[PDB]
Symmetry: D2
Subunit: 497 residues, 4 copies
């Protein structure tokens, strides 16, 4: 009954997957913890099993990673960059099958599964150049006969805890950067995407082994909250990068603070699109559709709040309802499918709870609101009008395709309403007005980490730093000088005289 | 009875000080909380009194600072830099009397009191240029017809809690940089340096008033742990910069993380000098003396551990104990004095307690270890030989002039011994060996924030970022790109097509 | 009789000027060359005299400057910054009287004279901060046990040749930056602005001498083409910064290239404003007025071409003609005057010849075109319609207030017409269209060094690099990383193993 | 059978797409109506194959096609330009052994160095892919309310690239990779004696562009000599001219470009010194000096030509160097583990003999070498001369041959001055353990060169740094740090949005 044992899913064997897989890698493969079965959300059928990390496995892995670090930190950064280059190429070779796995086990559509792998490929290619650039200034000392230099060094072991919804790319952004920065990594992915974590780790492990390097440079310990908490409490984990809910992230951040560790937190979002009266509606409508319903509303950057100027509110709502009706639903790996399932049955329950709460708080479901009558975790993408901007349910992140729509009149009030929530990840305005655009980007504009114009809330690329403010946690990944979070600065005065 | 009422201390009135002073400034002066008297630690005489902040005063001041922010954040950064330029000149004008107040109330020697004010003047002058530079890159988007820009904006209200020992410079580094970055400030200084906080605030207030700017841009709420905890818990304080003990700093860090605020933590040190066999002993001996006994051992960067190669250990210790015997003791503001009192009686008790625990743990006091028989809080600067490098008292920061001396033989072990403690502020080696120097600066070298060569642990200048790692808390102040901690990054994609 | 000998000009003596002044400074004052008398362009009266540099003076000065460099280059950059801070304050003390001298000898209105001095003060203030920043990265070597550092060192002697029209500020930009970068300076200003060059040099000389530094760090050799040519040919002049005509600059550039020196060329402009149909005309008209007629048309950044969309051409021209008629003409020291004389009688002749050439080429003088019947070098500010955009006289820089007006229809053609001239200094569009703005800033936009939107061609500030492309010569001054032009880069690999 | 390409043992040449006669113009189309040149193997003086160079008409057509191509290329986002450069890196990777071998065959340097050049190009390509997501300027805080201030960088347009014989792949590669990601189109004129290498490289690039449906004139080739080079130097359509070559020609090129207010990037001659202090590790100094002086048969721009040795250690170092020189394996440069090949031309051999005689006239003593080797091809003995004054005319002159001039010194100040007294300013190296001396060398009273090295010879450089020299070396930089800015135009842009 396991999908991996069915002829049609034989392609899973191309990723080295079998009926039961080792979920611990530290140079050797193992797993003496609980065996987990993951399921395909499109049909609720079991795919395969992963043997998770026991406490002893965790302990052994940390020690081995730290031993490997002594070798790795001695390799020149440009040479570490060559390893990351080879990782990029290894990912390229497995792009279709790895993206197909993301669609199968996570449930996003194929083009996005593949796109996710491509993101990891792209950050590897970026990191190769960065590996010849990272460092600080040599500064002019006020003291005669002295040099003053800013040095950057690896922090050591970078733990990486990742969410279900970007089961490849988030790890990738962290890995590529942490690696070139001279750190070793320990990955604990989402339990419900354990096969993806295993598959990615196999690809990287082959590269490390082919280059005669210790595998524990990119260690894996599959597990749940138990392993995650161990990481958060472990003084040997010098930086903990955590991508996940604000509720869990808060606790991770506190645990890391308690031990004077470093954390990089990438937490929840409650992202707004705002359409002004001068907006190009031919642009607004598809943008909002994609931002709200893409990945079945399971992106951290998903649009969950849509503010529309009173003058165009009804036309936009009507056009969006028509667009929602045209959405092609089906198995996420099938041709021309744009809409797949929610990742879990619990997510379906949370969706229904949110819809009922929206109604009690005074909103009207104008499209959707129900579970679809078909196998898997499918729900109707949903549009709610009539809530106050400050409705409790609108201020909460429900990780499901529910879009709350609000009217507004003026720019000052709607910027404030963008900013009034506790989340601070992404935000977008649609307008042609030059001044309004630069005000949006300025100190009285959006308070979010991602501040977009005429592109929706999921608009981001490798070259920029990615993350948010407020309850989104403050960390940054990927581009700009995000790398500095994975290194320790020293200010060094050398008296040579 | 109060020093300010004696003709010889009439100069205090040049700083706007009176017998009883208001300790709250927000545009207006007040203070409804407890009245504190501060004392001269050289003679234990009372200087004057300060009316501290009640809860109502704090609430009033936060609200006024937040209102002022709306005005201040709209002022172009270069024009903010002009205000900072004027602050610099205003401090210049009062450098001698302000330096004298620092010597009187805090107890450091006049040249260091004056030097502290000069540090604030210097960071103001640096910040004037920086106000025309702060920002991020315009990056090449992968999307045709799109711009990608990294913007930086003020965080809002910067709370600044400072320690007794640098009662002007630490505030100054935070103020000058926070200001040019478009933030408003709220200062809560050490209670035992309340007159200094008031004096500095008077100087800045006049500049803001003369420029028709709201005074709450540089607010003051004198108080103790009550006010400081309020600040740590206040969601209205967007960034809390805290300089102080690790113990307190840990709790402040936790309170800020609980509310998803930002913290900048500048905590304790336990700084090592390491003298290799090829060291210039004519440089090591006076460097170690200054690093260990300067400010009566009350710098966060004070040398508390001295590792000496076995071949030269006895010669250095003997030469150092001769040097200690020559130190000139007196009132810290008096001519040619090099050594003043400890800041409080409690510090004397802690000094005595450490000296005795050092003995319980097996150390030998080879110079000092006694209180001095004279008015004020004077202790003998102390050298302890014989302890194991891992003696619990050597691993503890005792904020007094006790120098623990250790033998070593090889480089790798002594680098490990630098690094074994929980603190990570400053470190220094004295050697001529080129390879050893670059190894010290590299990934297997010092783990500290300040990594020095042939200059002691007290060596730093405004052009570099200042701060530590591990239990020192990770924050940076002053130079390089420390300004980024006082601002929020956004990554902005503009579809202009 | 000399104006300086009349009682109402006694304020000239506040600048230390006398009836005959030494025009050579190198630590000592002299000048054995020809004695020049300078004249006020508002009335053609002689002001005072300056003893210029002979060949022997020049030779002695270059030798003394290179000797001074030995000392200066050994002073830490931040301490050089301290000298520059003091120069800025010394300029502040004399801002009104120096500004008055600029109005008298050069002929621009008083607010611009004072503004010019303020520009030098402001670049000094900027440079103080930059003196703690200048340098390059420490880079990650691909070689184990090697360091890789980019160092920057002074070039040595920076010769600075300046134009008549910004007789303080151009020198200032070069001086402040060159100085903090560890260079010594040799100034030859415009002979018709000799008193200004002397006055500025007296201010700097006092700072250097007060600080017991050799005065040849900021040397002065007043003279004409002879001294300028010597500088261009002198291998001891490591960098020659030349601000002036394209014609002269081309020859300076070739002379410097022949000897493998460095040049920084800041040459002519032919700057266009373009007004699109969506422009705010209440903004276009006053911006075009200021940009065209400010400084009597004698800025390098003066608007000389105005392209107006066909829909709005006649209205814009009608509004400009009206605005020109309200210009207040007179003595540039009269506080209500907005328009003074051209700098020389030759300039009047060139103006007249350009006006008559414009007519011969088919243009219509719609406003002005005549020499004014009054004392001094006054001409009417002039507007010419009806020429083709590629009319010969329109492609020529005539350094006088003549604005050539053209119609256009589409964006692509008008961007091409901005770009078709040989000059490449400044450019401006007036529009509200977001896409057009970004395209203007992009690879198919303006080809100039200054690319402005909704602000005219004279829009620039010290934080940015200033200069142009094409026949404007390529050099940059003032902000961003313009400082690198005044230093030599080295790429340094250190094998420490 | 006369041509090496028609002999069976060199059939590997065809793996590069080379034939008996090859088109030496590429602009999307291949051609060449100019003079046919035959290039020769310096190891055996045999002709390899032929290349049809550019006529004036070819040049004109190619510049026009390049400028049309620029309109398309500059509109492609920089990261997508980066992706093309990535693919160029991979295409070079595929041909690395055979293109390296052609470098050894046509140019004459040993195989590890020919392979090494191709690897350098691969490596700068990989660097440029990251850089393509990074290039740009700051957004600055305007002093004006309601205004933005932005520093923008845009392509200059057409970058002409003239290269020398001695790095016939790597120098083009550094310029190409960077120019391309910066949105420029390129026009290459390589050394005539390395025409086959230019053709082979251009075939690799052409295939990548054409496979990606891009116009090939993005990376155009016009093989030729001084006539084509001069045209480029005079052409207003060539926005930046990057010239690598002799100081004598580079001066003229720089003057032509300046005359027309174009931009030049000049990478000219060197006269590079190694200085060994009394405290130097001799076990390091000797092999370093050997590699730096004799590597590439003395035909690197960064070749060590002057060796200053402290009086106390001079005789020992010279003796050890003479011993090491006698142990070098000589052979055909494309054979693995041969360490010493021929000079590039018969003319270069004659100039070597002339320089040795000049050294003797000026009072020097040849303590090793000085003669031609008794073997086929342009082989000369690597040569050590002692006894000259540091200011000897022939020591101040760049002779592109393996002649090392050795000098004694006593004091640091004097020997730093002697490093600096020549007109060239490319590379320099000291060997010492003294911390202060090392930082003084790096400081304002130290080396005046563009490359300033410590305990590694004069040929020590890597792609992450900017590469180039000062003084008569011409001032240009290639490869790393912010060298890219020379391939772009800066604009300072004020936007009033209020
Ligand atoms: N790009 C920029 O920053 C600026 C450019 N300019 C340009 O300057 C020109 C107006 O100023 P002018 O003083 O009339 O220019 P000019 O070219 O006649 O003279 C400029 C300076 O060069 C000197 N000089 C004259 N002949 C020389 C020679 N053969 N060799 C060396 N130096 C020589 C003059 O004495 C003077 O100091 C305009 O073209 C204007 O656009 C003016 C200000 C700024
Ligand atoms: Br998007
Ligand atoms: Br107020
Ligand atoms: Br110190
Ligand atoms: Br005339
Ligand atoms: Br303006
Ligand atoms: Br022809
Ligand atoms: Br032809
Ligand atoms: Br010859
Ligand atoms: Br090397
Ligand atoms: Na279902
Ligand atoms: Na006492
Ligand atoms: Na007149
Ligand atoms: Na031969």
């Amino acid at each position: 009954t396991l999908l991996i044992n069915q002829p049609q899913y034989a392609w899973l064997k191309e990723l080295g997957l079998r009926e039961e897989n080792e979920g611990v890698y530290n140079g050797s493969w193992g797993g003496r913890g609980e065996v987990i079965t993951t399921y395909c959300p499109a049909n609720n059928e079991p795919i395969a099993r992963v043997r998770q990390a026991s406490v002893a496995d965790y302990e052994e892995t940390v020690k081995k990673a730290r031993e490997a670090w002594k070798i790795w930190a001695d390799i020149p950064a440009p040479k570490r960059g060559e390893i990351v280059r080879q990782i990029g190429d290894a990912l390229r070779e497995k792009i279709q099958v790895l993206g197909s796995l993301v669609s199968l086990e996570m449930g996003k559509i194929l083009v996005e599964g593949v796109g996710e792998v491509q993101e990891y490929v792209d950050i590897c290619d970026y990191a190769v150049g960065l590996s010849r650039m990272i460092g600080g200034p040599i500064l002019p000392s006020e003291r005669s006969g002295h040099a003053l230099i800013e040095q950057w060094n690896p922090v050591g072991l970078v733990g990486i805890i990742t969410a279900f919804n970007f089961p490849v790319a988030v790890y990738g952004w962290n890995n590529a950067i942490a690696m070139i920065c001279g750190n070793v990594c320990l990955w604990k992915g989402a339990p419900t995407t354990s096969l993806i974590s295993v598959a990615v780790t196999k690809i990287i492990a082959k590269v490390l082994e082919d280059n005669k390097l210790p595998g524990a440079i990119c260690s894996l310990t599959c597990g749940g909250a138990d392993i995650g908490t161990a990481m958060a409490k472990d003084e040997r984990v010098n930086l903990l990068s955590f991508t996940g809910s604000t509720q869990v992230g808060k606790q991770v951040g506190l645990m890391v603070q308690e031990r004077f560790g470093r954390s990089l937190l990438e937490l929840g979002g409650n992202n707004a699109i705002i359409a002004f009266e001068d907006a190009d509606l031919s642009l607004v409508v598809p943008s909002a559709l994609f931002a709200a319903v893409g990945t079945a509303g399971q992106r951290c950057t998903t649009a969950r709040r849509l503010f529309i100027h009173e003058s165009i509110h009804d036309e936009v709502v009507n056009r969006l309802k028509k667009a929602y009706a045209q959405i092609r639903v089906g198995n996420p790996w099938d041709p021309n499918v744009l809409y797949g399932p929610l990742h879990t049955k619990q997510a379906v329950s949370m969706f229904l709870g949110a819809v009922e709460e929206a109604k009690k708080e005074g909103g009207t479901v104008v499209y959707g609101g129900k579970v679809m009558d078909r196998p898997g975790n499918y729900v109707e993408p949903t549009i709610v009008t009539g809530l106050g901007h400050d409705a409790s349910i609108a201020h909460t992140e429900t990780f499901a395709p529910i879009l709350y729509v609000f009217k507004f009149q003026n720019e000052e009030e709607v910027f404030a309403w963008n900013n009034e929530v506790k989340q601070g990840l992404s935000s977008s305005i649609f307008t042609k007005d030059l001044g309004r655009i630069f005000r949006w980007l300025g100190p009285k504009g959006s308070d979010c980490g991602i501040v977009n114009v005429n592109i929706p809330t999921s608009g981001a690329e490798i070259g920029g730093a990615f993350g948010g403010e407020k309850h989104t946690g403050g960390g940054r990944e990927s581009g700009s000088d995000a790398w500095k979070q994975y290194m320790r600065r020293s200010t060094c005065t050398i008296n040579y005289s």
